[PDB]
Amino acid sequence: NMMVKFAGFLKPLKKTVLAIFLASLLYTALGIAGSFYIKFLFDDLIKFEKLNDLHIISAGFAVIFLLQIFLNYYRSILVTKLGMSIDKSIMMEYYSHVLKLPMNFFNSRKVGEIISRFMDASKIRQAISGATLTIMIDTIMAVIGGILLYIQNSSLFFISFIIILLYGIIVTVFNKPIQNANRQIMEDNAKLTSALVESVKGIETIKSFGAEEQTEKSTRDKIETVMKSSFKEGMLYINLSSLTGIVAGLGGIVILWAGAYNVIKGNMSGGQLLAFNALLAYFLTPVKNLIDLQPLIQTAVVASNRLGEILELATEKELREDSDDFVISLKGDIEFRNVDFRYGLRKPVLKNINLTIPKGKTVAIVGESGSGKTTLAKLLMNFYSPEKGDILINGHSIKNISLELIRKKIAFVSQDVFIFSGTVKENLALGNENVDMDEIIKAAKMANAHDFIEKLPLKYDTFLNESGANLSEGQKQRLAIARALLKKPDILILDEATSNLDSITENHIKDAIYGLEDDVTVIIIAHRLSTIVNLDKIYLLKDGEIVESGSHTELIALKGAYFKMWKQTE
Amino acid sequence: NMMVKFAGFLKPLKKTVLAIFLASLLYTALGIAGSFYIKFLFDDLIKFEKLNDLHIISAGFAVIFLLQIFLNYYRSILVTKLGMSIDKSIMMEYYSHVLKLPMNFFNSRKVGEIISRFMDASKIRQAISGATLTIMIDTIMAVIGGILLYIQNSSLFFISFIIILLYGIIVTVFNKPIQNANRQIMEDNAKLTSALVESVKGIETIKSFGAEEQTEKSTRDKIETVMKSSFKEGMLYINLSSLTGIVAGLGGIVILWAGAYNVIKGNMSGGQLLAFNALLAYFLTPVKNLIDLQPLIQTAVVASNRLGEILELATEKELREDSDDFVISLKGDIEFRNVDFRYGLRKPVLKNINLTIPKGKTVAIVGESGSGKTTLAKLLMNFYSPEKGDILINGHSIKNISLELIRKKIAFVSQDVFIFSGTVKENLALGNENVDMDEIIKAAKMANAHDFIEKLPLKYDTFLNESGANLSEGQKQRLAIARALLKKPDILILDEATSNLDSITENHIKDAIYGLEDDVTVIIIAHRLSTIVNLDKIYLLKDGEIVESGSHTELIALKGAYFKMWKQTE
Ligand SMILES: Nc1ncnc2c1ncn2[C@@H]1O[C@H](COP(=O)(O)OP(=O)(O)O)[C@@H](O)[C@H]1O
Ligand SMILES: Nc1ncnc2c1ncn2[C@@H]1O[C@H](COP(=O)(O)OP(=O)(O)O)[C@@H](O)[C@H]1O
Ligand SMILES: [Mg+2]
Numbered sequence A, B: 001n002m003m004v005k006f007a008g009f010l011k012p013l014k015k016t017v018l019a020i021f022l023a024s025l026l027y028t029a030l031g032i033a034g035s036f037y038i039k040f041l042f043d044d045l046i047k048f049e050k051l052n053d054l055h056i057i058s059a060g061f062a063v064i065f066l067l068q069i070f071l072n073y074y075r076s077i078l079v080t081k082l083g084m085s086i087d088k089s090i091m092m093e094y095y096s097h098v099l100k101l102p103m104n105f106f107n108s109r110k111v112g113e114i115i116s117r118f119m120d121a122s123k124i125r126q127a128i129s130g131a132t133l134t135i136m137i138d139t140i141m142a143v144i145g146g147i148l149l150y151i152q153n154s155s156l157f158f159i160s161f162i163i164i165l166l167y168g169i170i171v172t173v174f175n176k177p178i179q180n181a182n183r184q185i186m187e188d189n190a191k192l193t194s195a196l197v198e199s200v201k202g203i204e205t206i207k208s209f210g211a212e213e214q215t216e217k218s219t220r221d222k223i224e225t226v227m228k229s230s231f232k233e234g235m236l237y238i239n240l241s242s243l244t245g246i247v248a249g250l251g252g253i254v255i256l257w258a259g260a261y262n263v264i265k266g267n268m269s270g271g272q273l274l275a276f277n278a279l280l281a282y283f284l285t286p287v288k289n290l291i292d293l294q295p296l297i298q299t300a301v302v303a304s305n306r307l308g309e310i311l312e313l314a315t316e317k318e319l320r321e322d323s324d325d326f327v328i329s330l331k332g333d334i335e336f337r338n339v340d341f342r343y344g345l346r347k348p349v350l351k352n353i354n355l356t357i358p359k360g361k362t363v364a365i366v367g368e369s370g371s372g373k374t375t376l377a378k379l380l381m382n383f384y385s386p387e388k389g390d391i392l393i394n395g396h397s398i399k400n401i402s403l404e405l406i407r408k409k410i411a412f413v414s415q416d417v418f419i420f421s422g423t424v425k426e427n428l429a430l431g432n433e434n435v436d437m438d439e440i441i442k443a444a445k446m447a448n449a450h451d452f453i454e455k456l457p458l459k460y461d462t463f464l465n466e467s468g469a470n471l472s473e474g475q476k477q478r479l480a481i482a483r484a485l486l487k488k489p490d491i492l493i494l495d496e497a498t499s500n501l502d503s504i505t506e507n508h509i510k511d512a513i514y515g516l517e518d519d520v521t522v523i524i525i526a527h528r529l530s531t532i533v534n535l536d537k538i539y540l541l542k543d544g545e546i547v548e549s550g551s552h553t554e555l556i557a558l559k560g561a562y563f564k565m566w567k568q569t570e
């Protein structure tokens, strides 16, 4: 899974990989050659009292070490570049995938959890970094060191092998619980982050009710739990570090003891013993360094696994059934047939809805709060799929239509309006892009928005903050209408789009609505019944079920729920 | 400033530090014996071929090393405990302070930057992180190892001194740009995470308009900027590590060269040279290991500075003047006297407000969207201070009253209702640690919310997820009204709280308001304009000016702007 993903990123880049591998051979060879300095020092130069040869040999070994450092520098640069490319690919893929998940995923999870999942990729960046990724390369290169040590002294070789076996045993034994603890601490920190975002969002309410002390007391338990998980995870490192330190240091003492015994037995002389001890830094220290990074590597593995959970979720388009290519325009009659829907496993929201919106007409959806009108709009726009029944457009199931066409021919003006940080030109031309300014200004004029935008500085270029508060509530709601009309939708849905506008702007928008292009279906969802008295048909929702349908004239003519609503409200 | 905070948190733990210092002191003393071990190996045992002495001495030094490991383990446990305590103290202090910050702070800065600073405080956790402090502890005691080096030899000690000087020079020279690069990368990452948060928040609109690629492209650009900064930091680290490797390796080889020259001259025995070389692991290796972890303290320093940037900001209470203690009840005449307010030198939102609310009456403020009604309400609750004029309650300036009293006797029902994750009982009792169950049920019945609470699976215990996604808008408004009523305030402000309610619930609410103690002033900010006919006084707000004021019949008789609105909306 993730292993295949990493391999795929490495397929295009081979020259760097070949150079990285080949440069490591020179580095290890130079280090091995430079190890013998102490042997040459304690067998010939010191014993025979040679001075000039001492200087020459020292200069040569210093030169060798300089070349070794230069090779290490080159390899480090290449490794850093490779790791950066891989990290960029990983982050880009994760974001591109998370932006295409179904809506129920966003409903189920919280913002903080998704944020924490994303930014945990920084842990992966640390592991793939050049300084770390060098260490494993040395571990693969330790085979040459092992062969050389076996060639030097066979008896001493079966003393470092045992050390590596002990290292591996410790590594597995602490590999399991360390992974468990890192997963636990990541989950706990994700829980902490989510409650912090909620605290920031509702800062106004918290301040108004004086609940700062209560909120910080609530955050204690999450901070305390994070500290407990860290401390429990802390001792797993100390135990690992101490057990490794037992093997590493005591292994050196044992090796020195065995070498002294061999020298006393007249086997290899002291110089070869010192050479063996020094050369051991290219067979054990690379392994010892790698084991010391197991805490950091385990963190990256858990972070990647957590990212893997999201990437395994099927996208919105993947779930969709094969799309019929014979449909290009959503022109016709929108029909609901026994549609039932429930937000998860709770009580049903819509119960046996049967609708028939005539082609190129304006219809109305009215009802009390929480009666499923916005849910009907979302179902028509296919954010959620109906549990039972189907939605037909011109006699064709909405399931058998490409998702892009549905989301491009249908415009939504939600109950709220979301404004992205950028110029007003960018916000108006969201998604469409590459559109003539003549079209944008025409849409803004059509929505009675060209005036207030003209007064503010920079015209269609002023900067807007995240959910720009410098724009009034009515101003933002005018942008959404202009944005919807900008795409020339085939079906227009207005969800409380006339709630914060004066009579003049409402009349202007109505006049624009009655004459966009003709034969365009317009669905208006509103609570003020007075504004909706001049439409073709009106549907009344009563707790997820239509009760009476028709125009305004006959709906008041027959006495019922609509008549009571009209009389009470006016 | 920050370093003083660290010192203040170690004052209680006097005994713990002493144990770490004493245990650390014996650690280095036990660890020095390895040098004497190699000296004895290559000076006496090998030369004279003693076997039993070899075995005995090897066992003794193995025991010495075991004691050293045990002391290191105990010290590491203590260090981890201390680090966890300090970390917890710092992080909670920051969270509390950021919760106490003024309101205008949250308007300028997006949530993304704040959360980014919060979770970049994790690098301080990664920096202390137990074992890291042991390296500084060894470094500060590397002096005692160094002192005997001068006794053992002079020239080699001077060469090691030169090595230390080169370390220090390199550390400073690369210290400065490392801080620069770390600050740059943190800023870029904060921008990236803010963009991600903004993208996730408006996922519905992005999907509706098909703006996935544009958001994806912007995120790609932000990621590229982040990783360009990261690449610069990586090259800086590579250069640092390569220079440190040069100096360390040349230092080791020069130690060997000078020691060999001394041995040839007969200054010291070869065993003494080996002891000196192996003892450098307690004078230089602690220093080099500390320098290797420079990209862990500089990152921590930058993170701490970024947190202190927020911590230096004055809290809401600090900016307030000497609060009068003789005011306990916010009952009287609310008067606005030439109040002028602007949202950060942008434009005059309210100009010369001259308003007076009679004591214990119900007064409604009406106007077009963006006129500044919510701004008036927020001004009355000291979220912002007017740049000109003053607000008086019973003849006393509002800025001269205690902040806690102001926000405890004034209830605000915002246009958007915020529901915190948890039980319904928790949300209804926000701000009050506990009052009673009779009061809560009375308020819920008063606000007509008790009926739909009972229908829930767990009455007053149902778990509301995030922002009450399982609750309708009307239900959320009813909960907010009940929560405001439960406070039992002196001034009640309704900011279009009746927009989503139906006829019967609104009638119940308005009957409940009339049932108050006749001393609770009620301010009703409404947009419907038909919910005002039965109110004491009406203020018409236009372009931040009170143009018309009076009773409903009086205002209609005036045939002014209010009359136009009344005849247009009805
Ligand atoms: N994400 C969700 N999770 C659970 N329930 C939901 C969700 N969205 C809507 N509902 C339920 O659907 C019903 C109708 O909601 P909605 O259509 O948004 O408001 P309205 O009916 O006023 O347009 C509400 O009672 C609400 O409880
Ligand atoms: N946080 C803010 N930052 C900048 N400008 C703001 C902010 N909040 C409101 N404004 C501006 O001040 C005015 C206040 O209008 P507002 O009180 O929201 O009207 P209403 O009371 O009808 O909602 C708006 O025109 C808006 O542009
Ligand atoms: Mg709705």
Ligand SMILES: [Mg+2]
Pocket: B373, B374, B375, B415, B495
């Ligand atoms: Mg308002």
